Symmetry: D2
Subunit: 212 residues, 4 copies
Amino acid sequence: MDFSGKNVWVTGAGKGIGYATALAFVEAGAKVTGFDQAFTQEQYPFATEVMDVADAAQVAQVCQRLLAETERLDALVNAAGILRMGATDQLSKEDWQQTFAVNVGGAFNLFQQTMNQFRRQRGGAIVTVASDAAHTPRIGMSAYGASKAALKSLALSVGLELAGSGVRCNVVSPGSTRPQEIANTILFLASDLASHITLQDIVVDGGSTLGA
Amino acid sequence: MDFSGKNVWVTGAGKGIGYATALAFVEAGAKVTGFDQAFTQEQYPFATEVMDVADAAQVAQVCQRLLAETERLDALVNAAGILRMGATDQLSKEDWQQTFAVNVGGAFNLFQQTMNQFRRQRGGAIVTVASDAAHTPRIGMSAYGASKAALKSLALSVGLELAGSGVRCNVVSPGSTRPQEIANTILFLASDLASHITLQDIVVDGGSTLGA
Amino acid sequence: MDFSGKNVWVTGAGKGIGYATALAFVEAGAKVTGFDQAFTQEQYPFATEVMDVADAAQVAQVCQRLLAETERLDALVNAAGILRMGATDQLSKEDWQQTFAVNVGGAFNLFQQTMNQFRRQRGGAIVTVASDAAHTPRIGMSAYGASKAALKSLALSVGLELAGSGVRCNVVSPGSTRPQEIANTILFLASDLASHITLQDIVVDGGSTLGA
Amino acid sequence: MDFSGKNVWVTGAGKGIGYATALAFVEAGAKVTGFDQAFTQEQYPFATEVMDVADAAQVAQVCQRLLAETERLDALVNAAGILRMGATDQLSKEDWQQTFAVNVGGAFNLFQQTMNQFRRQRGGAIVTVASDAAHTPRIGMSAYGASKAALKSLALSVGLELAGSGVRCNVVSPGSTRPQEIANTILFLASDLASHITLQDIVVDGGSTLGA
């Protein structure tokens, strides 16, 4: 798609959608930094920064160091997330808390660290990965879906806060994990092809929500 | 509306919407228990139980005691909530955490304690008070709106989980606080007039969201 | 509900939802005029006016006569409609045309004849009966659902046009025909209990659309 | 994007979005047929067929001739439309009728002529151009918005009818006319990059609907 000379951040980049998206931006010519709670392999095709999105103080330290060295952040992709399933009244409190800590608190921490960069640079793009579970109640995914609804809500709110600065802020809502297809939708929303698309949420699940 | 002989629980009953709704159920003839983090006055027209919805262990103890004595819970109204405002990148971590702890975790704790009662009794009604902030991004209310989107999502998911048991589960989304009007909408959704209405969300804000 | 001293118009009043709603307003003490393409029985509990909503010139003549004699129109209920089913590529052109003529053109004609009354009187309520078919694609109901989506859209647009005059304009979306339950929802939306509810659409179908 | 060897139909191809989209498919290597009520210029870069989408008998003759000669229809883009504005009670009956005849009846006629081709070939893509007016009430656009809501509804219904045949059916909702940007979104939805996206509607209006 040609993101050459563009600086791109992708969270949850160690695995799944985040990894696929980081690889896609690399192939499109972008300078990519991938962030994750930890990295397993010894070698990655993008720059790696250990950063758990759920850890506010760590996100603070890492982002603050990186932003001091970068002239602009062309795209931020929030793709970190965890899935913990169970009936609402059977879900453990640990699972409930970690679900929200990662799925909502993570993007919140990123937004707290990056919003001023977006304001000052006056443009760029944010893509946040939610879930079709945020659109329709799914069996066993009450907490997951709820956290992903909060994430989508937060993403559009940040979109409104950054609209005056010319930042496009969109959401992708995948179904059950395919990662390469999600990556294609993220790249599109991050590209100049989508320059008048903001506050939108594209559901990529083969029509499962029937337009919801 | 005549809820005589009906057993009704209302959370956040010390003030605002919860109080207005508890009073309305009392006037309609219901046996009402009001719950709040604390009670200020010395006298209330409903039975009062100190219970912070955000405190899982307390919710456990109180609900478990009460359910052992009650044959059925005809209506549960989740009306506890807190509002903490600010730009996304300026909001304190304390405000972020308490927002979610109360606005989402609260109803989660109630659902964990009451879902089996609803299943076993095979019917009844749940009404959950969200916000129009969950429907459209509002300035200064990014976290509040996000928490209220999670709450609505969770409420509809519990609605789906309890649909087989004949429980109606609906949401009311008020604008900025009027409490008596919200109470009227809650009573309607809790009544037998609304017996085929479930998984719905009525926005009561004078059209502010333009149908969103 | 006590609509005594209120003047109420209900279209499609000869049968189904319109009839049930007209009867309910009569029982609540309202002065009711029912309108239909034709009336079958010899006796009705409301005043009857033969008026096919699809016939613009007839709607013009009837409404213009009636409005000259009435000081205010407290509630207008659009409940006329027809259902013609079939696969999209099998539906006859006659069925397609009549579907839109009645389901959309009907309310359009009413709005053309009544909007100035609402503006001049500065208040009142409009309730329009759409369908859950307008919310989610239903098998065999492509044209019906499409016409009902247009109707809902038109109703909210008229709601916006009349918001400055203090008119509340809401939609009820029933599932497959129960009429007494729909009537209860219409009366609620038309009442002073719902005075801060406008541009809303309540789906009454037992949760079939899963919140859509 | 490389649609070489793909056969693509675009309606409303003489001007605006339809023209821009037809040109874009040509540049991407597709075999393009453009359809319009009439063609003004003497020369176009795509094959042209005079066909008013609103004229069912003409659509029948033209489509039936063309389908007899084509092995597959890889993409259908419905981009015909007219805009007639005015307050609801001031809009002329001619404007009301033509709005629906073109904006809804047009795609209906195309669907009646092409659905069996899509079923038999077992795949392909449909993109239908609605409007952000279908998402939120806009001043002066009550009829236009209503017709575009019907169009979107019909498009998703056809999407459901063709889902079993592997056809992707999506909607693009532009704001006030930019055509090249809409064309980019249409090409994306028509491409194999979007192979798991169906029944979706992308609003391209710079965030005007605030996610609605």
